[PDB]
């Protein structure tokens, strides 16, 4: 049984380098073509390039220009990434796949890099107050926070029905920004309490906002 | 390098349609080729290789032809789990390069969105920005155009949107518009509207509210 | 190191078939392409498919699509090309050749080749004729003496002079196919003291025939 | 169908740039027909010089290197040494099939030039008894390897019952061929006089007889 598990992505300054692996199982990389793909947050497919196992050349896009290293150790059955003079467009996922007739037939979990010289901070969470048709809807925002993620439950989690919790996206701060809302009934407004639980790990952030008219 | 051109960039589709997609190279290619499938957060999966041939275990529904500059993969029967994005990967030149992809999502009646204005919580005004949200809610088809007016002055570069995913039990999609101001800069105007243009409404909807009253 | 070990050489009439092999060996079978290459007289090369060896998929020359069947066999990493219905037309000698890709798309490594000869000429052993000088005297110290070792089949034969004893100065050109036969010849470069006062002879062979003849070398 | 051409033969010196060409037919050449060059040394050892239009393949010299200049592919080679003298094959891909042209022999210069050495032989009476007749020119040691033969019957151009063997090297690495006229013995009967021109780097060696 082929695997490929990829490490050591995580946070980066920008003009600082990464290191990432890739350990393969139920095969020797030492007989195999190894590539490098990688994908932005909500963007497409990139080759980076791969590495011949019949003479060691290593062949990159251009793109590149020779900040990208690709190399091997078959002792530890390991492809290694480097990536030097990181910018914000190497901020990605990035897999390790194994190669036969030129297609990819093995892939790793994928290795997620951040590119970036933000500072990890909790969200504010401000309310989405209904307007005061049979239905309203209300929310909140969770806004200026880094790095991702952040969850969203509204009422601990008795009201998933109708609730909609967008994708962040990053603002030209280096912090996120997001919203989650719901649509309920325009009757129970006052008879019925929604409260938005917001919840960011890195900076142990644990907010509880009512939300009302 | 060599510029891949998938078309269309989404299509809908029904289960049991027959669905092409085609990869257009700027030069021969040599038939080198391949097609991959890609679902959210996971790591994309062979389908086809050397333009025509069906990788193994893959689905005898998916094909690949042409040749040339001109390729395309057929979808004979879309079955439910057919729906996710797919590329080309063209490796007749190094650097190999992706197309930009086709989301293939589920067609469904045309849907209107209903339309939904946040000011700024009076929490949020007190530490110097605003946040102003425009709510579009369970709507299809996807392509929404959602324009903010500031007395009646059309906006350009302070607003960002997200979109979800097609919700999984009605096939509709909700986007929100978040306009950012700092407080000065709300202050300068009363007047505060977003209008939405999409095919579900006779004309554009406007939801619009007076500053602080 | 990559090799492409091909079978040997073949010898068959027309509407024969012929089925030659190309053992790859030094890298993963499914990860170039193997071409098929018709060499014809020695010079001119025509490409005739390829194979992508994975799942054999093939692409044919339209001008052998009936002639030639592209084949591979991945358990023993070797690509096969079965010519049918030879005529005189397909005697050439048959390359397999490697071709990237992934980054250079070069035909890279070739096979030896393998030589396809289609007559149906019998074996026939060869007249042997002089080749005498007679344009006067002597313009040197030195003189030409041959023998015309004429219409033969298969190839080859082999010649020598005055048993072996003269080895200098000897050359023993390609053959040439005239009417279905093969013909070509030999020359000895002597001292004109050397002849006709001492003789020069012809060892002419044909192994396939096992014939063996002498030619004499006299004045015109 | 179209046709690749590339020129007949090219000599060069050691340490010189020499540059070969190939020729498209249809149009200029492009990075769609996948330019590949093919070097073929003696004993017919093929070996893939550059692919892709500009690729050199690995384990080839760096003094190699391919491109497109003007609308035809080529092949430069920066301080050719002595080890790449051989014939080189230019294909060109269009969109389902490859053509080759019809190659180069280059020679890198690596002793003096040498002038054929030519002797004509006239049919011996006994192939005379055969009603044919058969006239041999033999052509040794001349450098580079490349000639050009024709024949001559009473003055006049014989356009037809002539062959000629591509040249092949001797054991001093210089070049040998042979030619052959082929006649009935009627027609050698006939005619009076018999020429074997051989014509190397310009200069028309020849031979006669009566």
């Known amino acids: 049984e082929v695997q490929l598990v990829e490490s050591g992505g995580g946070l980066v300054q920008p003009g600082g380098s990464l290191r990432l692996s890739c350990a393969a199982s139920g095969f020797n990389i030492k007989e195999y073509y190894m590539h490098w793909v990688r994908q932005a947050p909500g963007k497409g497919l990139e080759w980076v390039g791969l590495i011949d196992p019949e003479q060691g050349n290593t062949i990159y896009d251009p793109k590149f220009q020779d900040r990208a290293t690709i190399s091997a150790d078959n002792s530890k059955n390991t492809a290694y990434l480097q990536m030097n003079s990181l910018r914000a467009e190497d901020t990605a996922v990035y897999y390790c796949a194994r190669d036969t007739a030129a297609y990819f037939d093995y892939w790793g979990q994928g290795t997620l890099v951040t590119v970036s010289s933000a500072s990890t901070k909790g969200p504010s969470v401000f309310p989405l107050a209904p307007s005061s048709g049979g239905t309203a809807a209300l929310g909140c925002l969770v806004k200026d926070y880094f790095p991702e993620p952040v969850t969203v439950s509204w009422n601990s989690g008795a009201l998933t029905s109708g609730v909609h919790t967008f994708p962040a996206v990053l603002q030209s701060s280096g912090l996120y920004s997001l919203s989650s809302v719901v649509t309920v009934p325009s009757s129970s407004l006052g008879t019925q309490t929604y409260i938005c639980n917001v919840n960011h790990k890195p900076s142990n952030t644990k907010v509880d906002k009512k939300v009302e008219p | 390098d060599i510029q891949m051109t998938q078309s269309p960039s989404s299509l809908s589709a029904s289960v049991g349609d027959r669905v092409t997609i085609t990869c257009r190279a700027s030069r021969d290619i040599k038939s080198y080729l391949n097609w991959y499938q890609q679902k959210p957060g996971k790591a994309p999966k062979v389908l086809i290789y050397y333009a025509t041939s069906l990788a193994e275990g893959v689905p005898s529904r998916f094909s690949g032809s042409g040749s040339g500059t001109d390729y395309t993969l057929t979808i004979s029967s879309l079955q439910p789990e057919d729906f996710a994005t797919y590329y080309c990967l063209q490796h007749g030149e190094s650097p190999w390069t992706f197309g930009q992809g086709t989301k293939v999502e589920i067609k469904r009646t045309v849907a209107a969105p209903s339309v939904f204005i946040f000011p700024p919580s009076d929490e949020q005004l007190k530490s110097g920005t605003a946040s102003v949200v425009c709510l579009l809610n369970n709507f299809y088809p996807r392509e929404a155009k959602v324009q903010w007016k500031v007395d009646n002055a059309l906006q350009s570069g302070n607003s960002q949107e997200s979109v979800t995913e097609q919700d999984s039990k009605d096939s509709t999609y909700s986007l929100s518009s978040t306009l950012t101001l700092s407080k000065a800069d709300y202050e300068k105007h009363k007047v505060y509207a977003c209008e939405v243009t999409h095919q579900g409404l006779s004309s554009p909807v406007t939801k619009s509210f007076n500053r602080g009253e | 190191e990559v090799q492409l070990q091909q079978s040997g050489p073949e010898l068959v009439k027309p509407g024969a078939s012929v089925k030659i092999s190309c053992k790859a060996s030094?890298?993963?079978?499914?990860?170039?392409?193997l071409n098929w290459v018709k060499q014809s007289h020695g010079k001119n090369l025509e490409w005739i498919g390829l194979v992508h060896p994975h799942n054999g998929a093939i692409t044919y020359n339209q001008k052998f699509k009936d002639k030639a069947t592209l084949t591979v066999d991945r358990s023993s990493t070797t690509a096969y090309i079965e010519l049918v219905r030879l005529t005189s037309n397909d005697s050439a000698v048959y390359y397999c050749?490697?071709?990237?890709?992934?980054?250079?798309?070069?035909?890279?490594?070739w096979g030896q080749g393998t030589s396809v000869t289609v007559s149906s000429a019998k074996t026939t052993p060869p007249s042997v004729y002089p080749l005498a000088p007679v344009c006067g005297d002597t313009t040197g110290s030195s003189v030409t003496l041959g023998c015309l070792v004429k219409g033969y089949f298969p190839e080859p034969v082999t010649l020598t002079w005055n048993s072996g004893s003269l080895s200098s100065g000897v050359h023993t050109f390609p053959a040439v196919l005239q009417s279905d036969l093969y013909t070509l010849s030999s020359s000895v470069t002597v001292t004109s003291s050397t002849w006709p006062s001492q003789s020069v002879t012809c060892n002419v062979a044909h192994p396939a025939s096992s014939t063996k003849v002498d030619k004499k070398i006299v004045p015109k | 169908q179209a046709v690749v051409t590339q020129e007949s033969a090219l000599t060069s010196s050691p340490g010189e740039t020499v540059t070969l060409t190939c020729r498209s037919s249809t149009g200029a050449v492009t990075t769609s027909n996948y330019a590949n060059w093919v070097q073929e040394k003696p004993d017919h050892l093929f070996t893939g010089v550059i692919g892709?239009?500009?690729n050199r393949a690995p384990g080839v010299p760096a003094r190699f290197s391919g491109s497109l200049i003007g609308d035809k592919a080529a092949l430069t080679i920066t301080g050719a040494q002595t080890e790449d003298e051989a014939i080189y094959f230019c294909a060109l891909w269009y969109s389902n099939h490859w053509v080759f042209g019809g190659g180069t022999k280059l020679t890198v210069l690596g002793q003096p030039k040498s002038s054929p050495s030519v002797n004509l032989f006239p049919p011996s009476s006994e192939e005379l008894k055969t009603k044919k007749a058969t006239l041999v020119c033999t052509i040794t040691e001349f450098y580079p390897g490349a000639v050009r033969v024709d024949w001559k019957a009473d003055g006049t151009p014989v356009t037809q019952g002539d062959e000629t063997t591509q040249p092949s090297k001797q054991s001093n690495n210089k070049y040998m061929a042979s030619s052959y006229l082929t006649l009935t013995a009627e027609a050698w009967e006939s005619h009076s006089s018999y020429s074997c021109h051989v014509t190397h780097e310009g200069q028309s060696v020849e031979k006669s007889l009566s």
């Open positions: 030094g890298y993963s079978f499914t990860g170039h392409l």
């Open positions: 892709g239009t500009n």
């Open positions: 050749a490697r071709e990237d890709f992934r980054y250079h798309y070069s035909m890279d490594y």
